[PDB]
């Protein structure tokens, strides 16, 4: 397990690859459940950076038919929907470290385009040593990323079924390479991928969960397999056996057309991250980054699209890895059969 | 999830439903292990509302062959047993709020019998906040309870295989609301569901839990069925595949035949309660509330039945909710394939 | 400084002294500004003795008008006061450890008739261990309570100046040894002395405070000489230095005659009790047991005198150690320039 | 649940049978995540019997490949790994309450090596309380014991296919019977089982697990079967449906083809452990003993045998209970379908 | 008031004068009453510079007659007396940080013989601060002790009547200068002055407690004159007003006529330091190290001195520093009049 003394190194490392230093400023936004250690660490890293750094504490905002402790269920109003002073106390700064949990939500696009970065820290420490930020990390993302920019569509098979096909173009790619180092954009430590959106109303084929194959934020491999029919970017058919059932019910509950579109797609470069990882973890550890970056995957969700500009403001919300898949960009193979092939430079 | 503000206010809307106001005194009831947010909360609230408050601390109470840290699976002796004091210290309240889970035990009837009520309060705050209990749950749970105290049979059928009889009439009816609102009442926040017993030795036929039924405390969604026979009021076979012979083995440990036989029985009304919940939680959060409260449901329950005067003491308890089940009093149905149809007032 | 485990191994000790055992119930009375060192220690002593036990939290009251921390100076209502619901849940307990100070209030009055014992125990835990109570302490005061019961008046001398007449036989004699083992009766961890009330309206003559005796709460060493003018049980003159100006200012703040009115007068037989400690404590440490209860004191006091039935209410409060007097009864001196003369058996 | 008030006694319980008295001296040993309660209490214990006590502790270590929170999972280095100083602070006392868990260490053995005993206690205490240490336990271990030392192999068979080998004799048996009372001597509270380590190089056949069997630390009833082909005591094949594409998958990540070594193989006696525990507990809450010592049980591991003068060093560790087995020592069975049934003075009441 | 990131960094300044690197091995000694930011921030300063760290927790040692909380009132028996393994764990120590006060105990001397090195630091951040320990310090305290080295007697006098001889000799100089960077030395954090003890049953003459001169740890400017008359190293009469009837009645509390010894003699090299500092604190603030090291001062003390191999085993300890002195060693002036005049190379800037 990590000590106080590591995690508090591991943060300035981390802020140093984020470009705190003397003439910056970093404001730690956090909330009651936020980790106390990673806060304490994190002001600790940025004041030994020389920087000047103050937190933010926000009470804790609650949706009332939002079930579990996992943070990315609900994607609605956040702790700062309403209150406009705590948005401008978070925009003062240069840098947010935010260990509460802001993503996909307008209030954080707003304090992006002022030029404040904001880097989310919510892993358990353990987690976020194992994946550590490293430049080589960012400078294979990055080479992932010249490829996906100059896509026009994304292909996936996979041998138990899977046969999807997404155009591209109308929608930017966007990054995870774990800091934040540019001004005005996000990132996540840990992470190590890549992803885009599917052209408006546009996605279509087969998407097929295999056994093994995982939903967040279920947390559960799939022990029988589900396949996604989809039409014109919306999941219009859900079938197989209890996973099936028991997904049809979650997404159901929230009585919404909205929660069946495909939103992000993209795949995994991070070989620190482990398909294996979620099964060594409870539920209420976090949220299982792991499973979201690790090398090779096909990643797609649902639900909300706002956060670029598209038709969705719903709640429900789900991240579904893919093992073993055939990613396409165009005629280009990216992945095959689980494997990053293209482009090199990308490789590890 | 939920602030310490708005937990205080969740406590003041659900203590002043229990009839809680200046002319009444509030003892908060906890041990080492209660929520310290909670504890505070209902502190904070009684007093907001004008009571006057005290805080009773007990011993924890161990069940030396009790597995796991959920409540409801051991039903022994409790930190009451034997304590004339500490009992006739919440006896002097006019309500209690049982942060800390006093079993249905001789003591705690013998406190709800001179008049002082008792709220259970445990479940996490954003769970309580789901299920906020209302004036309307209450009133549809009691026009169910007004069709269920006039039956003289049950009879539960499911496609799956259930085919289940059982005479009434010599037990009550027992609800739960939300909300500890009348004298001598015991409620837990949150509920919103209804109960009675069989009478001796007389319930008979077979109970499927099929495909996605559930076992409290196991806390697993069956992936295989689980068949159980059932001869005068106990369980006479078990038969299955692998969830049939752990709970068998589960059983066979408390080396008491008192284990099999048939407690309470009953149906769900509370459509804000989900039976996809449990899969969005781990085991230690709770009790799953949501399992044994989900709108149509029927639950049924092993071991124990001295609460109403029945004979058995034993400590080994299951609580087990069916889906997709036909449910009948005498020859009514008040719940067709896990949707609730009669009383019409009882419905959401 | 004392360990945790000694501290529970002391409470131990005296809880036995107190004739706890597993017959007996023990309630452990605090509120947010008691020790929680103490309230364990007492807690997991009273349960190895097999004990039934409870802790009782009460929200602390405040006095608006009550300078400092100390709770001896400002004696009105107490955190018991119209809480009914609360002083039955203490009363129904056969010993109650108060950690949060209720003496001289009525509440404790009824609590003491129903047979309940109290203990107060708030004082530091290595003053604890300094003057942990002994049999031998109890027998020492116990024999000078034989002869201030017989006594009808009582008389000090010193040669500082004090010529004090207090005539005797009104109001009973009160002992404190430090552990409370008969019923209906309060004792006070740590302690060793006793003490009266003069007959009402009656005492005279004057008192002087010398260089070097004490005002508690103050708690200061007078570095110039206070004398107290007495006629009719009243204070009617306070002359001297800067300490008089200051204690006539104090006094007059409270805008009520009853302040003046002399009540308790007896002297200390604490040997482990030492003068000098009370220039080791900074004044939030305790309420200064040591001036109260060292070897020989004249100890009187000023204010309430409702805990026997007197004529006064009032909250303004004093405790007033003399040092090298002569304290006689009737023609009988039990101290001699400071020095325990009599009974011989109360000596040490 | 246990109150702090009945912790302090079940450690003074314990420490009492591992014969810490006034003569004693007690290192109470920890990290940062050890369980308070737990420290707190055996330090108040082992005070109240007057042995001199003091707490060690040392900062947290982290293997940067670890994967998820149990103890067990990584065992290579330790927060005592070159320093020296703090092993020394350890070797000073007669007996050390480990909280942290140092077993599988080199380290340990060296500690043990000064004549310093080792009580691991770790598990929750409502798991400890559940299986407070007997000396009755100490006894029917013992016994067992007797006729593991004096046996030349050891077999398992079950009908799921387990057909399994293991020559015996070059290293010895490990007792775990819940305290520890005698000098030089590791054990952990609570147990209640007893295991060797084949020769080197020698265990051969299969091993299968079969739907419910368990591996550690996963806390995973299977639901499939997986089988493992073993030789010349190492795992050259895994098979079966998605469990074993998870383990495979899990031990390959290590990179170190010592993970396929098998380790310690032996049986379970504590029936007051239970193979139904594990499902109702979350995986943070321990490393399940009551998985590794449930009467009756099979336990084989995979990986390091470094503390017994073994060649592996290998972090990856699996410890894997299998029901309904028979266990043969020589040509006797000491287990038939998962009951024990040799020697006599073994089984439980 | 010092952050707890500053706090970690004044560690990390004072522990690298005191030579931890990651060669070295530092032991942070504890109990229930350490200061924990102060313990987190040496553990954490101690990690940082990649030294092996651990911490010694021991219960925490009542001595029953002991009155108030200032951890010299009642020296000799500390929670190491008797607990011979904890001693051994601090032994096995490059350095210890003390944050629970082992000084005027045996057991100090002991782990100091082994070459271990030992830092006091006990008093609160704010003032660790203000006399954060300097290079420049300890230069200037050396060249005070050079002079104290070759004295074969000290002498002090004022207007308000001290007149005392000490012959020297008999007995080393201890010097402060608030780190621990040569092996088996003891230093306290902060610091900056020395002193070395009277030959024995040698002491002659008057010290006269002036108006604002101090009692540690009574912690009050004496607003009366207190004469002390000293005959053969012993105080035998103590004379004046209220502070004399206190200081006698304490003194005699003890009963133990070893109290009346006189102990360690010096003066003050610490301009940081602040006579006026003790009036802004509370008394459980800590033990006001600005009063026993204050620039010009005398300071001398009473009771034990067994530290450096003395007679005297008693508790009672007094430290009381003087103002406005003359302070002579030989026939030459070192401090005149409450300034420091000699060695040069020992003022302040
Ligand atoms: O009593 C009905 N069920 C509940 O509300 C929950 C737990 C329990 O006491 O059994
Ligand atoms: O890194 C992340 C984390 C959460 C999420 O929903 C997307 N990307
Ligand atoms: O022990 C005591 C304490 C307070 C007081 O006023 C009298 N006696
Ligand atoms: O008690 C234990 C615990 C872990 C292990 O590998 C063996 N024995
Ligand atoms: O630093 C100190 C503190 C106390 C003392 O007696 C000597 N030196
Ligand atoms: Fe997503
Ligand atoms: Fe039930
Ligand atoms: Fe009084
Ligand atoms: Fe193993
Ligand atoms: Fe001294």
Not at 216 to 243: A, D, M, Q, S, V
Not at 312 to 324: A, E, G
Request: net charge negative.
């Amino acid at each position: 397990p990590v000590s106080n003394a590591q995690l508090t190194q591991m943060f300035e490392h981390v802020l140093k690859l984020s470009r705190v230093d003397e003439t910056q400023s970093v404001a730690v936004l956090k909330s009651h459940y936020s980790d106390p250690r990673t806060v304490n660490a994190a002001m600790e890293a940025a004041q030994r950076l020389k920087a000047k750094v103050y937190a933010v504490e926000l009470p804790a905002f609650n949706h009332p038919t939002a079930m579990g402790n996992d943070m990315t269920a609900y994607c609605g109003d956040t702790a700062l929907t309403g209150n406009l002073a705590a948005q401008r106390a978070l925009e003062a700064a240069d840098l947010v470290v935010d260990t509460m949990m802001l993503l996909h939500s307008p209030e954080q696009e707003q304090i992006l385009k002022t030029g404040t970065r904001i880097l989310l820290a919510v892993e358990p420490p353990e987690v976020l040593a194992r994946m550590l930020p490293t430049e080589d990390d960012k400078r294979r993302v990055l080479a992932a990323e010249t490829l996906l920019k100059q896509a026009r569509s994304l292909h996936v098979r996979s041998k138990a079924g899977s046969d999807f096909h997404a155009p591209l173009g109308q929608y930017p790619a966007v990054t995870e390479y774990g800091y934040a180092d540019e001004p005005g954009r996000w990132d996540h430590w840990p992470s190590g991928f890549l992803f885009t959106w599917p052209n408006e109303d546009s996605a279509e084929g087969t998407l097929v969960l295999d056994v093994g194959d995982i939903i967040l934020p279920f947390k559960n491999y799939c022990r029988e397999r589900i396949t996604l029919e989809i039409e014109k970017g919306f999941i219009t058919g859900i079938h197989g056996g209890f996973e099936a059932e028991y997904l049809r019910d979650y997404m159901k509950y929230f009585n919404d057309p909205e929660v069946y579109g495909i939103s992000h797609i993209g795949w995994g470069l991070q070989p620190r991250a482990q398909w294996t990882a979620m099964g060594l973890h409870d539920r209420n550890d976090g949220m299982c980054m792991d499973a979201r970056a690790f090398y090779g995957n096909f990643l797609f969700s649902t639900g909300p699209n706002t956060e670029v500009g598209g038709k969705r403001k719903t709640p429900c919300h789900l991240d579904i890895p893919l093992r073993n898949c055939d990613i396409y960009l165009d005629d280009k193979a990216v992945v095959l059969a689980g494997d990053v092939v293209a482009p090199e430079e990308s490789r590890a």
